[PDB]
Design a protein around this ligand. Structure first.
Ligand SMILES: CCO/N=C/c1ccc(OCCCCCN2CCN(c3ccncc3)C2=O)cc1
Ligand SMILES: CCO/N=C/c1ccc(OCCCCCN2CCN(c3ccncc3)C2=O)cc1
Lengths: 48, 245, 297, 97, 245, 297, 49
């Protein structure tokens, strides 16, 4: 959860709304196991 | 390289890109009570990471007419997290504190807050105005909890003493054009090795605007001041049932 | 025995408080070194950042061209003992004949020195103080006369029976210390040790002495710390019949072997009561003199 | 690191790009909530936009710490302090800051 | 010299002059989780003396017709003292236990209680009597708290298994003519290094009379059975707000 | 760094669990030693105190006069692998033509071996078990006939799409493991590793899988532990048209490389459901045969 | 903006304990991920079609 600790402050002349972009990844202690098929199958009918 | 900082303790981390160094009150770091200073015989409990962490307790709005506020320690935390539980279940308590007061604005706002720590901050009353009435401050004013309390007469710190000399105490200033936070580390201060977290407040935290907040019409007018603090080297002893006061 | 790494590399339990500063000998004021002109970029002594919380480190030498001055001005008169080891009035006891207060020839004085402003303001510069003391008792009649009268002073620690009359059995004083002296003798004088249950007395106690609800009727006990209450000082004319003269006993205290901690702002409003820092709200005065304009003397 | 679609709400074609970023703006200092999302990387939701979430879909079990880096794209004159919290299992959505 | 004993842990001490030794379950003492068995990365909190102490939670009356009772661990303590607070504020928990069941009578009373510890004690229902209804036990029956719960059909331990074989688990007997207490020490038992103190009960404590209480008219008829227990080597991790379930 | 004594002499953090017992080699039954008559006071092997919780330590040698017997009877057949590494029925799947259940030519079997009493009772002797396994699939028609039909078996781990028809795209099986075999071929057979997220599977889980209120409608999840749910086993006749024959697939499991912990009482009431230990309350039967009197055979 | 991923680790963001991680990375190698047979083609040889 993300909360306002204080506030977004800006002077006269700058936009009152701005955006945040979030980038995610795993740390170096991350591993995966038990190979399986993905939940999606990106095809409706036959691919021609 | 003195303006940038990271405070990590327990499972909490604070960052700042406009700091003004760090003050270590009276020049000494918090430490546990030695075997020769101690007097109580039971083995203490030292919870470590579950109580020595940052707690963000309150936010006040700084206004052109604000007078200033104060909070009492350890009162502000007696009802919060694992720290509070330990303070309630135990008769004896001791700890240091890392206080981090936050307030950011813009390069077009101005103002300066004096942030100080005053040990044994005893509150006085106006004695019925004429000084003939021997009134006393009510519990909600001496131990305001997490909401803190607003000063009635900041010039005399509601205690008959000059705020002009408050800088003789560990302090920092939040001068908007310079920094956006104050960080003060305080060791345990008392004439006893341990004491009650409920009956006795070791010190008060004062945040008072000395140079009033100002900005031009159109700039963000809501300028919050947030209080975050972390107990350090907490120790508890004299276990029994939980008591709130 | 321990084994998990976080326990081994733990600092839990460190009892040695790391100090960032240390005391240095300073019997005289600092000397002044010869300095010359500096026309540098990068080096800037005059510029500070008060926000940090420290005081300016700029010195005479770097702000102006100075000569050499060998300063041998002593710093001895500003030690705590120099400042405090001077006897001042801290209590007064009246033993009138036909009066309102003590018309029984005896009196109990609660040992509290906060009833006199000169002394009180000095000690209140510090939060905690530990010291021994020399108490002197000056007795005479209200006109300053000396009469052939014998008195008994008794120190009654907390828990000892307080005399309730000139003939109380408590004056047998088999364990409490008492002083028998004539008004004609020089002022009685004794040494008193540091008697608190705490490591130091404290002029300020932000808290309550007991647990429970802190309702209106109990707010008189906010700030009251028993560690500061050393007991009662009782005095009586030694006899079974009323004395022929009205007496006054002035109590002077001279601290010695003083240690103090945590300095604080000095009182700037008149004192009203002994037990608290209450000030008159309708008479809050500036700390000092004022003028009509900031651009005129 | 790949972009996490915290703002996974718009669904019409012309607004799809808006999922890549979420807003912050001047508030009324009541420590208001800005956004929330589950940290579960292999679960339906925001993490599906990340390469981690997708590769994660080819494995039944995973283990390890994750990291989310937030980049502020407001003007240079804008300032602010945000509190970002991770609530381990068992703790319900925090009602307040 | 085997009949006499003293158990001291934290600020609590238990004495007994009619013991029957002490059982250390599965032959091993409680220990903290090693760095290679662990998986969670945060530094744990190990409160020590404030949580590893004896708690006396409940007293049941033994009667000629009693069927027996059970309590679940750590469920019995989740709402008591500093231990409970830690169990609520943390996601992860682990600990061992020292269980001391007390029951004294007179040299003219008789009866025998079987006191045992059964890990993963899953409760079953009578399936609507006919066995065609797939009923399930309610929360108050699977995690009865400190009051414990009375067995409906002790012969099958309310789970389709013979109580006659319960002695394959760490146990002691309180045979009135011999001893007045049972003491069992249990190490942490689970297939994971840490787990939730709220969602998972590591084991159940069963106290069941196998040889019924008896005495002649005139002898004290009220024979209480008291349950006292102490966590050992408690560790907690995954801190957040307090949660009761 | 540490300094206060209680921290230094602390045992907080000891990760080595002290064990009071240790294993000894025992390939054969114990031998019997020659013993003679003992007529002593003080020595009393026959007397025990079951209250302690231990089993009797009295041996043949001390209760009767014994001869010497060199016992070479092996203890090998009672090891966990000997007891468990025998394949038994744990699942059955029907693929009928015109039926109620699977009239679509495919079926999904939830991997849970608790539907068969013989096997279930054996594993439930222990609380925790860790093991690899060999699964064998025997297919034929309901009469035991063998027909020229091709099948596909696919292991669908939790999170992978379960086929919803004989023609589901999921049968592309690009990552899941699949087995293609004819009914005429010998039974298909594969090795399966220990797949739980936990260090061991557990036949009993006294708890709930999630936090929250555990109200009536959720009580079906009491005792459910995801660490035991390994997924789905799906089977289909390989084709786009319905198969000409009805099939049955029997699933046999043979554990190997077994480890087990915490033994428990063995089931003595009939099993009713897979997910729980529910028993029929109106038919609670004694564990064994009974007789008319304690003094007669 | 630099283009690199964060180099912040658990150790510097919270107080951590020591964990000896022996979880294998073998199943995420290219051969592990790809060496599993999957359908890639289908051919029909009907009678009357
Ligand atoms: C034969 C009898 O002679 N004894 C004389 C005597 C004189 C002084 C005496 O004790 C003097 C102790 C002075 C301590 C004054 N303090 C300690 C701190 N304190 C205080 C007062 C109000 N608020 C906080 C602290 C004080 O007023 C005992 C005996
Ligand atoms: C090409 C496909 O071939 N794969 C076949 C296959 C066979 C078995 C398989 O996994 C078998 C795992 C058996 C685990 C049985 N367990 C573990 C514990 N458990 C359980 C059941 C009910 N309550 C508690 C635990 C179980 O039922 C996976 C694939």
């Amino acid at each position: 959860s993300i909360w306002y600790q204080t506030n977004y402050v800006v002077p006269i002349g700058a936009p009152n709304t701005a955006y945040i972009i979030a980038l995610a990844a795993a740390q170096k202690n991350f591993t995966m196991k038990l190979c399986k098929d993905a939940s999606d199958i990106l095809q409706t009918g036959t691919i021609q | 390289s003195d303006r940038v900082a990271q405070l990590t303790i327990g499972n909490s981390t604070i960052t700042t890109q406009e700091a003004a160094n760090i003050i270590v009150g009276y020049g000494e770091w918090p430490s546990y009570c030695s075997d020769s200073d101690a007097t109580a015989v039971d083995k203490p409990t030292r919870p470590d990471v579950s109580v020595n962490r940052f707690y963000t307790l309150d936010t006040k709005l700084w206004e052109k007419s604000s007078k200033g506020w104060y909070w009492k320690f350890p009162d502000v935390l007696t009802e919060t997290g694992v720290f509070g539980q330990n303070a309630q279940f135990h008769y004896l308590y001791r700890s240091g504190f890392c206080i981090h007061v936050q307030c950011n604005a813009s390069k077009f706002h101005q103002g300066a807050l004096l942030v100080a720590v005053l040990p044994e901050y005893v509150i006085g009353t106006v004695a019925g105005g004429t000084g003939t009435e021997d009134t006393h401050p009510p519990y909600k004013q001496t131990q305001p909890g997490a909401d803190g309390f607003e000063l009635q007469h900041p010039y005399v710190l509601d205690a008959g003493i000059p705020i002009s000399q408050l800088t003789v105490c560990p302090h920092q200033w939040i001068n908007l054009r310079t920094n956006n936070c104050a960080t003060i580390i305080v060791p345990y201060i008392n004439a006893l090795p341990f004491d009650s977290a409920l009956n006795h407040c070791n010190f008060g935290l004062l945040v008072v605007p000395i140079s009033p907040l100002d900005y031009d019409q159109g700039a963000t007018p809501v300028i919050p001041i947030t209080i975050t603090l972390a107990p350090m080297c907490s120790e508890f002893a004299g276990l029994r049932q939980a008591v709130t006061q | 025995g321990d084994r998990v790494a976080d326990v081994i590399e733990s600092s839990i339990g460190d009892s040695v408080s790391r100090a960032l500063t240390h005391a240095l000998p300073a019997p005289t004021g600092q000397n002044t070194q010869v300095s010359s002109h500096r026309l540098d970029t990068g080096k800037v002594p005059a510029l500070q950042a008060a926000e940090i919380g420290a005081s300016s480190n700029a010195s005479d030498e770097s702000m102006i061209e100075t000569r050499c001055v060998l300063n041998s001005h002593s710093t001895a008169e500003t030690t705590l003992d120099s400042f405090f080891s001077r006897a001042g009035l801290v209590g007064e006891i009246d033993l009138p004949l036909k009066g309102t207060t003590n018309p029984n020839g005896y009196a109990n004085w609660d040992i509290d020195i906060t009833g006199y402003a000169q002394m009180r303001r000095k000690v209140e510069l510090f939060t905690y103080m530990r010291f021994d003391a020399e108490f002197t008792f000056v007795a005479c009649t209200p006109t300053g006369e000396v009469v052939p009268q014998l008195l008994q002073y008794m120190f009654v620690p907390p828990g000892a029976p307080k005399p309730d009359s000139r003939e109380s059995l408590a004056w047998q004083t088999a364990t409490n210390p008492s002083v028998f002296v004539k008004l004609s003798d020089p002022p009685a004088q004794v040494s008193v040790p540091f008697m608190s249950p705490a490591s130091a007395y404290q002029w300020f106690y932000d808290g309550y002495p007991t647990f429970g609800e802190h309702k209106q009727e109990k707010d008189l006990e906010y700030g009251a710390c028993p560690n500061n209450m050393m007991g009662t000082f009782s005095v009586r004319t030694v006899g079974t019949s009323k004395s022929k003269y009205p007496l006054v006993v002035r109590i002077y205290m001279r601290m010695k072997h003083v240690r103090a901690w945590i300095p604080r702002p000095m009182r700037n409003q008149n004192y009203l009561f002994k037990a608290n820092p209450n000030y008159a709200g309708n008479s809050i005065k500036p700390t000092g003199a004022s003028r009509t304009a900031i651009t005129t003397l | 690191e790949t972009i996490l679609e915290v703002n996974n709400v718009p669904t019409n074609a012309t607004s799809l790009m808006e999922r890549l970023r979420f807003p912050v703006s001047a508030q009324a200092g009541k420590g208001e909530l800005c956004a929330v999302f589950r940290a579960d990387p292999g679960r339906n939701g925001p993490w599906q936009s990340t390469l981690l979430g997708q590769l994660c879909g080819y494995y039944t079990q995973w283990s390890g710490s994750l990291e989310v880096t937030f980049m502020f794209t407001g003007s240079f004159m804008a300032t602010g302090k945000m509190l970002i919290a991770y609530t381990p299992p068992g703790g319900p959505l925090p009602k307040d800051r």
